[PDB]
C-alpha cells in the first residue's frame, strides 16, 4: 500500500542576475550550497540513509555536465553511499525532481530524499559539432544560454522553432491577451516581489552564497523601481506588432534549491519537522509554438485525478515565464487576472527563473507561503520549452 | 493499493561503433526509431493515452540537447499531448528511465508509458567555457565524447578525476581481478555475443535504421574472430603495469531504445501484450576511484528490499563496462566468473556500450532472454561513472 | 651609386594539390620548406650561410604558416639560423611579391643573395574566433579562413562591399560584358593547354615531389591534381553559376582552392659567379594597381600599364604573359582591355589556375617561374607575370631571358 | 642601369600605445591602422593623395580584424582612393620597420616615389584560432590563442630549435650573457624614469594623434600612452616575482608588455618631395637583417646592427640616437654589451622604451624608425640608428641622417 510523502525543511540561494552576482560561481558548487545547508540546518539527520539526491537542470553542458546532482552532493559533504540523478524537463526539471522524489516514497522504494534543482545561465557553455569529413569548413559555435541550438529541419518544419518570446507572442495573440494587460500583471509582480523582499519573506528561504570573502544573500533580479509607464515605453521583443518585451517576460538567471522529503517513518527517524503533504504531480503536452498553455492540460489533469477544484487552493504558484502566458493560462482556469491566491509575493518576472531551479523554488515558496497564510492546500504549476507543462499539489500539515 | 507494472513491447537500434554505422544519425533522429518502431509494431494502442516518455541521455550537450525524450517523441510522429522528461545517471540512464516509469505507473499517478535511451557518441560536441572576463585569453575547447570535462578542483582534490578505465584498473587492484580472468571473460562475450547474432537472437530486438539509401540492421561492435591470443597481445590503456586493455573494456557506440511499460487496466484497453512485471529498482554510491563496484551495493539494496536471493535470478545481465569489474561484482555477489545465467548472449564487450542505452538495453535483452529460456526472474544491473550502480528486478508473466 | 642588375636562377615548385587532397596532410610551414630543401640540393656551389634572407609570400598566416612562414620554413629545410627570413602578405598576389621585393633588396644594393618563394595550405586553413568584448558574452563565434572575408568591418561593407571572389568575377563579367559562352572557352583552353603541357613532361621540370606515408607505405605526389583533362565544352555549358541561375561565374570557369609552394634563387651578378649559379633571367621591374574592391579581378589593368609605362616597353612586345586566371571572366577582360586577343598564343600556353588550382600565397612565385621556363623553352626573350587581388588590386612583373 | 635615388621620411604620426584590454581594446586593428593614415592626411594638404604609390604597413598576427591584407583594409577605411594598392609585411616585432626600409628599397630601386610606410598590431583583440579537422568525427579539435608566442606547434621545430616563449627566451639570454636581475632592473628603472620626463616635456604629445572611442554618453578620446608607470622604484623592481619560476630573472617590470596601437609616415624620392610640398626629415641609409638562435632571439640586433655599419661603413658610436627596442632588459643590456655600448649611454632611449611605452608587435618598429627621427630634431643630432630583436631568432637594423 501507498506511503504519504511530507516534505520537511527546504531552501535555496538567492537568484542572481546572468552576468551578475553569482556569474563567478559553478553550476556544481552552486548545487552544493543548499545541500550544505540543509546539513547544518538538519543535525538529527543520519546523512547515510539518504536514499537519493534527485536535481533539475536543464542544460548539463557546462560545469553541471555528467550527472550534476551527484557531483553536487560529493561537493556538499554527503557520504560517497548516496546516489545522484539529474531529471531535464528544461524549466520544469526541479519540480520534476520533487515529484520524481515523491514517487519513489510513495512506491515503498524509498525513505529519505533530496529533490531540487540548479541553473548557471551566466556560466553556460558553448557547443561545437564535430567535423562530419575531413577538412570540413563548416564548424560553427552555437550559445547554449537559453532556447534552441543544434536545429533538427525536421522539428522546424513541422513545428517551427519559435524562441521562447515568439510563443508568448503566440499566445498573446491566439488568447487575446493585451499589452496592458501584460504590464499590469509585471508590475504586479515587482509590486508583491519588493514588499515580500522587504518584509524578510525571501530571507527565510535563502541561505547566502560564500565567494572567495563576498557574500551574496539577496535576490538581485528584482526591479521595485518599476513603474506601468516605463513598462508601456519598452519595445516589444519581436517587432511593434507584438507584445512580450523584456520588462513582461522573465529573465536568464543563476540559483539552486533543495529541499527534503520523507516517509512518516524517516520523519520520526531523523527528528524532521514534516510540513506538507504531496497530493500528487502530473505532466501535459501542448503545441510547440504555444508552449506557454503548456500549464493547463497539467492542472486539469492533476486536478480531475486529486478531485480538487482550481478554487480550492489557497496559494497558486505560477511560474511567470511571460505575462502573456500566465494571464493566458489563469483565464484558461477560470481564475482572474489579479486572483490574491496567486504568486502573492511576486513571481519570476521580478524574480527571475535559473531553468533547472525554478520549479523547486516554486514548490518551496509555495508551502512557505501556507505556512505564512495559514492556508492548507497549495498548487505550483509552471510551463515547458517545446510544448509541456507541469503541476504539484501539496497540503500543509 | 499499489498498482502492477507491465512491461510490455521492446525494441532497439542495432549498436554502432564510434564513426561508424549510426555516425551520421542525430542524436534525437536516432531516438526517434525505436519509437516509431512501437507505433509500427503495436496497432491498438490509442496513442495520445500515452502518459509520458522517460528517455536515458548522459550527455545532452548536442543534437540531444533541451529534452530529447520530447523532441525523439515529436520526431517519431507521437501526438503533441503527450510530455517527454530526460534521465541522467550516466551509464544507467536508461535503465533509470525504466525504474522511473515503473514508480510513476505503481504510485497510480499514470497508466502507459514509454521508457527508453539513447547515445550518440560519435556525434557528441565539443564544449567550450564562457569567458569570465573582457579580452579573455582562457578559452579552451573540450571534447564531451566521453568522461571528464569542466574538472572541479575540489572534485579532483578529494575524489579524483579518474578517467573510466583508470576506475578499471583500480577495481581490478583492489580486487585482485587478473589479466588473465579478464580476457577470458572478455572471450566469452565475444563468443556468447557471436552465437546469439548467428541465432537471430539481436534480430528479434532489433529496428533497422534507414539512412540516406543504407539500411543499418547489424550490431557493428562484435569481434567474433576475437582469441584468447589476440587478447593477451594487446597493450593495456594506462600503460605496461595495468590490466585493462581496448579488448576487455566496452567501448563508444551509438544507439537507442525503447519499451512500453503499462498497468493492467492499460494492457486492457490498449490491446496490449504484458511480458513482465516490474518487481523494483535500486540505486547505490561507492568511490568514484573504484566505480566499477558500483552495482554491488545497488544489488544489495533491491535484493534485500524484495527478499529475493541473487542466485534465485535465472538471468542476470550485468553490464560490462569494464571485464576487470564485472569480474569483481560477480565475485563479491557470490557468483561464478562464468556462471551460466549470466550475460548468456554476451555483453557491452562484444555489443559495445551508447551511456543513454545501455540500461534500456540490458532490462529489454533480460526480458528477451527469459522468453527464450523459460526462466522467471530477472536481474539487471550496472555501474556508473562517479560512483554509482543501479538494479533492476523483473518477473516474466 | 647605379642600381645592381638581379638575376632569378633556380626555381623550383611542388605538385598543386586539390583541396582536402593530396597534399593536403602537409603542415603549410613543412610544405614551404620542400621548395627550400630542393633548391639546396640543386644548387651545391652555394655557400649556404651567405643568403642575405628568404621573402615568402602567404595570404593566410592564421594556421600553421603563422609568425612568419618564411623564418620557420628557412629552419625546418634545415638552412643555417644565422638567415633572415620575412613573410609578405597581398592576398592572391603575395607569391609574386616575395620575387619583386626580392629583387628590389638587391637592385638597391642592400642584399646579394636571395630566395623569394610562396606557400599556401588552403585546405589546413583554420577557423577563428574573436575574444569576447565582455565577461561572458553570448557573442562568440567561429569563422572559416580558407578563403574569402572574416571578421567584415562595417565601414568596409557600407563604402566598397564585400562582394565574395566569385561576386566579383560576376561583376565583372556584367560590366565588361564578357559572356559564358566566352569564359568557357577560355576554359576550355586552359584545360586542353595543360593537359598538353602535364604530356609533354613540362610541368615534371618545374616539380620536386612530394613524399606522404600510408599505412602499408609511402607514395610520392607528383603530378598537378587539380586538372580537368576530360574537360570539353559541352560538359562546361551544364554547369550551374555559383551565385545563382542569371550570373556567368562557374566552378568549371574559375580556379580552385588549393595547397602548393614554391621557390626561386635570385642574386646579383657577383653572387651569381661566386655561388656557381646559372642566372637564367634578369628581373625588369615590378609594379602593382588598384581598383574598386567589386572588379578586384580588373586589378592587373593599372598595374600592367604602369609597368610597361615606365619600362617603356608595350604589352605586345612580350613573348610570353602569364596572366593569372583567377576567374575567366577577369581574365577576359583584362586581355581585352588591354589589347591582347582573348586566345593569343603568348598567354597562358601551358594554360593557367583554372586547370591547375591558385594555393594563394604560392600562385605569384609560380606564375614568374613558369613564364621564365616557357621562355626558355621556345626562345623567347621577355616575359610578363601579372595577378589580381582581392579588395581590388594588380601586380605585375617584367623578366628578360639571359 | 641608372642611379638609385635618395630617400627621404617626411611627416609621421603615431597613435597613443593602449595596455592589453585597456583604452584601444575596442579599436579593431584595421579600424586602428586607419587612424595615423588619416592624420597624415588631415596633416599633409600639400599631398596629391591619388599620387600615393603603395601604403607598406607591419603585422605580425593577421588572423583577426586585420586579416586579408590590413595595409589594404587600413588604407581604404582611412579614405585614400581605390587606385592606390596596399601590402602588409610580416617580421613579428620588426614588421614595422621592414615596411619602413622595404619601402626605402622601393623608392632607391626607382619602381615608386610616394609611400607609405607603418604598423598596427591590436594584441587585444587576437583572435583563438582552431584547426581544421583531419578526420570525420575527430575528437582532436583545440582553440589556441594568438595574443603573442607559439601556436600550431611544429615538432620537428621543437626538437631541433625549442619553442621557448618570448621571456624564456629573455631568461636564457639572461643567464649565458651573465645579465644580472640587478642590472635589468635598473635598466627598466631608466626605460620609466626617462619615459615619464618626456611624457611630462610633452614629446610624446608631439608624436600622437588621439583615438576616438565610442561610448554611451558621448564619444571620448585617448590621447596619452597608458602603459607607463612612472612612480616604480627599484624596491617595487626588486620584489617582483621572475615569470617563469623562482630562480630566473625575468619579470613583467623588467619586459615589455602586450598592447595596441598603430603609426605611420611618408617616404619620398627627392621629386615626390618637391611636387607633394613636403617637408624632408631625414635621409633613409640603409636597412639590415640578421639571424640567431631561437633560443636566445634577444640578440638578433647584434647581427643586424653590425651588418648594416659594416655595409654604410658607420661606427656604433658615430650615432647621436640609439632607439634599441626593448623586448626585455636582459637582451637590450646584452646587446649594448656586445655592441661595445654602456649600459646607461647617454645616447641610447633617451626618453625610454618598450618596457615603459609597451610594443604592439607591428607597430613598434615603425614607432621607433619615427621617434629616432624625432629625438634627432629636439637634439640636433645627425645620425640615428633602430634596432630591435625578432622571435624565432633575428634583427633588424635601419639608419637614417637628419636633413
Ligand atoms: S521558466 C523561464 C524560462 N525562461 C525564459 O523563457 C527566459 C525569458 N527571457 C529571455 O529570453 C530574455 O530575458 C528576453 C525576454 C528575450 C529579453 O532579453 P533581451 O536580450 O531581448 O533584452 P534585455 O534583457 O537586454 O533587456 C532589454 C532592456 O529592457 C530593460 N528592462 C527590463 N526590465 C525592465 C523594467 N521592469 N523596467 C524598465 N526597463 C526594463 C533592460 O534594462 C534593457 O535595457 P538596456 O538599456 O538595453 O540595458
Ligand atoms: S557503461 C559503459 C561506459 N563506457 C565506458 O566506460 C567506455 C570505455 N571505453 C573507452 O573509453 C574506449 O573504448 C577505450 C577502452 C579507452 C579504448 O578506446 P580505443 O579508441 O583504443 O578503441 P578501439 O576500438 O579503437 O581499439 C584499440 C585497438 O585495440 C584493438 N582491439 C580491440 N579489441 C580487440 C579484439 N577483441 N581483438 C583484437 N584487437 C582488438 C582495436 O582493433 C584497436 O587496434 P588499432 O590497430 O589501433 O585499430
Ligand atoms: S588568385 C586565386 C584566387 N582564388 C579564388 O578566387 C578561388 C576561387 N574558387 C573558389 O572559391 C571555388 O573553387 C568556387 C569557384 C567557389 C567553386 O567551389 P566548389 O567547391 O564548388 O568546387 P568543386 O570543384 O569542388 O565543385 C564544383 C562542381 O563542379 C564540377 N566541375 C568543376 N569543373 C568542372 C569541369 N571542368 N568539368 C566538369 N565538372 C566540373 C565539380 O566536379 C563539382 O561537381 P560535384 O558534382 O559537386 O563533384
Ligand atoms: S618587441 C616586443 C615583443 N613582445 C614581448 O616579448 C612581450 C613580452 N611580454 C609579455 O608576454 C607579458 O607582458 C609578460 C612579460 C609575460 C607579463 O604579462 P602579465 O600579463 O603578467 O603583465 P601585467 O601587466 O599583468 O604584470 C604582472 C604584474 O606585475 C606588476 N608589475 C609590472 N610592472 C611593474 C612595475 N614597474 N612596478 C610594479 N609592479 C609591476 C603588475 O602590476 C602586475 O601586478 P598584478 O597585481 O598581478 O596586476
Ligand atoms: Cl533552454
Ligand atoms: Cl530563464
Ligand atoms: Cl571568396
Ligand atoms: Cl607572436
Ligand atoms: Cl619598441
Redesign the interface.
Known amino acids: 500500500?501507498?506511503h504519504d510523502v511530507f516534505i520537511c525543511d527546504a531552501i535555496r540561494t538567492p537568484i542572481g542576475r546572468?552576468?551578475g552576482a553569482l556569474?563567478?560561481v559553478?553550476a556544481?558548487?552552486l548545487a552544493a550550497v543548499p545541500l550544505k545547508a540543509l546539513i547544518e540546518r538538519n543535525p538529527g539527520v543520519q546523512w547515510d540513509q539518504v536514499?537519493?539526491v534527485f536535481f533539475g537542470c536543464?542544460?548539463?553542458?557546462?560545469?553541471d555536465?555528467?550527472?550534476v546532482a551527484?557531483?553536487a552532493l560529493?561537493?556538499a559533504g554527503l557520504?560517497?553511499?548516496?546516489?545522484?540523478?539529474?531529471?531535464?524537463?528544461?524549466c520544469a526539471s526541479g519540480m520534476?525532481a520533487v515529484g520524481?522524489a515523491?514517487?519513489?516514497i510513495?512506491?515503498?522504494?524509498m525513505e529519505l530524499v533530496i529533490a531540487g534543482g540548479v541553473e548557471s545561465m551566466?556560466?553556460?557553455?558553448?557547443?561545437?559539432?564535430?567535423?562530419?569529413?575531413?577538412?570540413?569548413?563548416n564548424?560553427?559555435?552555437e550559445?547554449?544560454?537559453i532556447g534552441?541550438?543544434?536545429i533538427?529541419p525536421?522539428?522546424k518544419s513541422?513545428?517551427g522553432v519559435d524562441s521562447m518570446p515568439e510563443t508568448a507572442d503566440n499566445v498573446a495573440d491566439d488568447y487575446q491577451v493585451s499589452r496592458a494587460d501584460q504590464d499590469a500583471f509585471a508590475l504586479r509582480s515587482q509590486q508583491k516581489a519588493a514588499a515580500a523582499q522587504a518584509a524578510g519573506f525571501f530571507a527565510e528561504e535563502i541561505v547566502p552564497v560564500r565567494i572567495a570573502e563576498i557574500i551574496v544573500e539577496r535576490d538581485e533580479h528584482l526591479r521595485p523601481e518599476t513603474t506601468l509607464e516605463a513598462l508601456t515605453k519598452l519595445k516589444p521583443v519581436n517587432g511593434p506588432d507584438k507584445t512580450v518585451t523584456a520588462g513582461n517576460a522573465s529573465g536568464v538567471n543563476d540559483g539552486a534549491a533543495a529541499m527534503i522529503l520523507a516517509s512518516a517513518a524517516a520523519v520520526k527517524k531523523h527528528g524532521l519537522t514534516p510540513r506538507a503533504r504531496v497530493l500528487?504531480?502530473?505532466?501535459?503536452?501542448?503545441?510547440?509554438r504555444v508552449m506557454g498553455i503548456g500549464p493547463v492540460?497539467?492542472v486539469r489533469k492533476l486536478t480531475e485525478?486529486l478531485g480538487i477544484a482550481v478554487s480550492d487552493f489557497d496559494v497558486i504558484e505560477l511560474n511567470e515565464a511571460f505575462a502573456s502566458q500566465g494571464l493566458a493560462v489563469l483565464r484558461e482556469l477560470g481564475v482572474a487576472d489579479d486572483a490574491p491566491q496567486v504568486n502573492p509575493n511576486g513571481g519570476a518576472i521580478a524574480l527571475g527563473a535559473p531553468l533547472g531551479m525554478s520549479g523547486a523554488r516554486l514548490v518551496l515558496t509555495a508551502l512557505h507561503q501556507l505556512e505564512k497564510s495559514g492556508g492548507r492546500k497549495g498548487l505550483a504549476t509552471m510551463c515547458?520549452?517545446?510544448?509541456?507543462g507541469?503541476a504539484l499539489a501539496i497540503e500543509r500539515v
Open positions: 500500500s501507498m546572468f552576468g556569474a563567478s559553478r556544481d558548487d536514499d537519493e536543464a542544460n548539463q553542458a557546462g560545469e555536465n555528467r550527472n551527484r557531483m560529493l561537493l557520504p560517497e553511499s548516496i546516489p545522484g540523478v539529474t531529471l531535464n524537463r528544461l520534476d520524481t515523491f514517487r519513489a510513495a512506491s515503498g522504494e551566466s556560466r553556460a557553455p558553448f557547443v561545437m559539432g564535430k567535423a562530419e569529413s575531413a577538412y570540413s569548413r564548424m560553427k559555435l550559445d547554449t544560454t534552441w541550438r543544434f533538427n525536421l522539428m513541422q513545428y500528487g504531480m502530473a505532466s501535459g503536452g501542448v503545441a510547440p492540460p497539467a485525478r515547458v520549452g517545446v510544448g509541456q507541469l
